[PDB]
Amino acid sequence: VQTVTLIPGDGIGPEISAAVMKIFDAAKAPIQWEERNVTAIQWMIPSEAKESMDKNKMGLKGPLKTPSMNLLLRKTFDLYANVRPCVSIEGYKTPYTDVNIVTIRENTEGEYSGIEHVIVDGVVASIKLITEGASKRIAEFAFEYARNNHRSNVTAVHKANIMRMSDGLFLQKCREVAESCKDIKFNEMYLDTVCLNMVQDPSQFDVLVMPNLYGDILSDLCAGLIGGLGVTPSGNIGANGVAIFESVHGTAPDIAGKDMANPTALLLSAVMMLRHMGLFDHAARIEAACFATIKDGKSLTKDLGGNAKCSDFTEEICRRVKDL
Amino acid sequence: RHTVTMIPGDGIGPELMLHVKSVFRHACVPVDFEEVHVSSNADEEDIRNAIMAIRRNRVALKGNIETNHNLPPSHKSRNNILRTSLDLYANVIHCKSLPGVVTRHKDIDILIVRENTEGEYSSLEHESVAGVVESLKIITKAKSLRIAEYAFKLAQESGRKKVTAVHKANIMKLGDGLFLQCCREVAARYPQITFENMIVDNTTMQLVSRPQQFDVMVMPNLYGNIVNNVCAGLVGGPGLVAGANYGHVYAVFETATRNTGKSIANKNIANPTATLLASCMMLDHLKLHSYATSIRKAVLASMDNENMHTPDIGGQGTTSEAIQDVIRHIRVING
C-alpha cells in the first residue's frame, strides 16, 4: 500500500479529485492520497511538492489554473514522454467509433526548444532542436510501452522529406531501436498522411511515436476523435522513475462547486496510473465500472451529457465497482 | 491558344495527365501542353529547366514529384524547390462537401490559404556537434503580410465573412507572434470581415468535431500541410480536392494533398476528380471560364452517381469508366 502525491488543483480540481478517491477505495485500492499544492515561488515549485514526488514517484494532477507549470513540472522532473491513449467510448458517441490509438510525444526538445532569434527587423528564426539522446530515449520508451501494454504496431511520424537532417535523425533513432525489438511491428509515415488517414479510418493506427510539435497536435486531434479533453487520460513519464498522470481539460471555474462537473478524464488517468504501477485488476474494474456507467444511460453528467450531477455519476461507479 | 507547362510527376501523375489531355480534346480546349519531366537524379538541371519553362509559360499543371527522404539533406525536395524558386507564396485549396460523397461530416465549406515559401520549409539545418541538429523555421513580416493580404482579399471577393488565423503563438512567441500580428494589421483594413484566431492543436480538434464553424483560414507553412490534409480527409480524401499555387505573376495547379499515390498507380483505379478540378482552376486562371465551367459541371455531375466512384471513395469503378462518364457529360454541353 503505497502513497500517491495528489494535486487537486483549481476550479473543479477538488471535486473530481474527491470523486476519484471515493471510487479508488470503494474499489479496494492499495492507494492513499498525500494531497499537495503546486505553485511557482521565489521560479520553483514548493518544497512541499518536489519531495513528495521524489519519494512516492507517482502523482495525479487535476486542472491547474493559468512561467508555465506545464513547463515547470517538465523541467523539474525531466518529463520526457507524453502519453495519450485514445479509445472510443461506448455510450459517448462521436462520428468515430473504432479508435484505439496511443500517441507518444517526445516532450523535451524539438520545436519547443525555447530558442528564437530576431535575425533582423521583421525576420525571426525559431530553432527546432533534435538530438540523438532524446530521440533514442523516446523511441526506447515507445517500444517498451508497446510490449508492456500488448501492442502490435508502432509508427514513427515525421516530415523528413522537408526537414531531412532533423526529422531524419529522429527517424534514424527509431529505426535502430526497431531492429533491436522485432517483437513489435514498425513503420514510418509522413505527418500529413497520418493526418489525412486519421480522419478517414482511425482504426488503422496503433502506437504513434513522434517529436514534440507533431505529438502536441496529433494527441489533440485524436482526443477530438473520441469526444474531447473531458474524457481523455494523459500521462507524463520522467527521470528516476517518476510519472505524473493528469487531467488536460480546463478548470471550468464557472461551475467550480456545484456538483456539476465530470471526473471521467482524471479518473481514467488514475486508471492509467494504476496500470503504470501494477494493480491491473483494480484498473480493469474501475475502468469497466466507468465504461458501463456511461453506456447504461441517464446517470450522465451535463457535459457528456445527461441531467445528473457529479456524485450521482460517481456513486453509480462506486455501486458497480463493488460487484466485480 | 495558350501554352501551359505540364510536369507529369511520379505515381498516378503520368496516367492522370493523359486523361486531362483526353478531356481537353473532347471539350476542344485551346490549350497546348508543353511537357517537362523531372527525374530522381540528384542533379538539379531537370528541376531548373522546369522552372524556366514556367517562367516562360507563366502557368503550369503538375503531378507530385516523389521525395526520397533517405538521401542526404543536400538532395532537397523538388516540389519545394519549384514552389520557392518561383515564389508561389499562396497555397489555396477549397474543401467543400460533395453531395454525392457521403462522409461523417456534412456542410463543410472551407477556403484554406497557406503561406507556401517560408516557415519550416526553409531547408536550413546544421549539425553543430555530433548528435545535435538545429533547424531554423523562418517567419518574416513581408511574407506574413503578403499571405494575410491574400486571404483577406480572397475572403471579400468571394463574399466570405470570417478569416481565422491558425498559429502556435502562445509557444512560438516571436515567430508565430509575428505572423499573427501581420494578420491583425491586415484585419484592420477589412473591418467588414470577422477576424478570429485559434491554436493549431485546438483547430484540429474543432475540425474533427465541428468543421462547419470555419470559413476562410490562413496560416504558416507546416500548419497548412496539416490542415489541408485534415480537411481533404473530412470531405472524402485525396482524390477529390484541387489545389492552386499563386505568385504575383506565376501560377501552378495540382491536387490539394500533394501525394504521388505510388501504391495505386498503374492499376486504372486513381480518382481523376482532384486532377480534373485542378485543370479547371487552371482554365479559370487563363480566363477560359466557359471551358472551365463545362468540364467542372461534368466532373461534379459524375461524382453524384455512386456507380462512377473509384475505390478511394468506396466505389468499384475504374479511372477510365469515370473519364467516360465525364466525357459523356461534356459531349452534350457543346453540341
Swiss-Prot record, chain A:
The modification N6-succinyllysine is found at K302, K309. The heterotetramer and the heterodimer composed of IDH3A and IDH3G subunits can be allosterically activated by citrate (CIT) or/and ADP, and the two activators can act independently or synergistically. The heterodimer composed of IDH3A and IDH3B subunits cannot be allosterically regulated and the allosteric regulation of the heterotetramer is through the IDH3G subunit and not the IDH3B subunit. It is found in: Mitochondrion. Substrate binds at R74, R84, R105. It is an enzyme of class 1 (oxidoreductase). Changing N161A: Significantly impairs the activation of the heterodimer composed of IDH3A and IDH3G subunits by citrate. Mg(2+) binds at D192, D216, D220. Its EC number is 1.1.1.41. Changing K128A: Significantly impairs the activation of the heterodimer composed of IDH3A and IDH3G subunits by citrate and ADP. GO terms for cellular component: isocitrate dehydrogenase complex (NAD+); mitochondrial matrix; mitochondrion; nucleus. Its main location: mitochondrion. The modification N6-acetyllysine is found at K182, K302. Belongs to the isocitrate and isopropylmalate dehydrogenases family. This is Isocitrate dehydrogenase [NAD] subunit alpha, mitochondrial. It comes from Homo sapiens.
Curated annotation (Swiss-Prot), chain B:
Signal peptide: none annotated. Changing N80A: Significantly impairs the activation of the heterodimer composed of IDH3A and IDH3G subunits by citrate. One of its GO terms (biological process) is tricarboxylic acid cycle. The keyword Cell inner membrane does not apply. Changing K137A: Complete loss of the activation of the heterotetramer and the heterodimer composed of IDH3A and IDH3G subunits by citrate and ADP. Changing Y121F: Significantly impairs the activation of the heterodimer composed of IDH3A and IDH3G subunits by citrate. Keywords: ATP-binding, Magnesium, Manganese, Metal-binding, Mitochondrion, Nucleotide-binding, Transit peptide, Tricarboxylic acid cycle. Substrate binds at R83, R114, D201. This is Isocitrate dehydrogenase [NAD] subunit gamma, mitochondrial. It comes from Homo sapiens (Human).
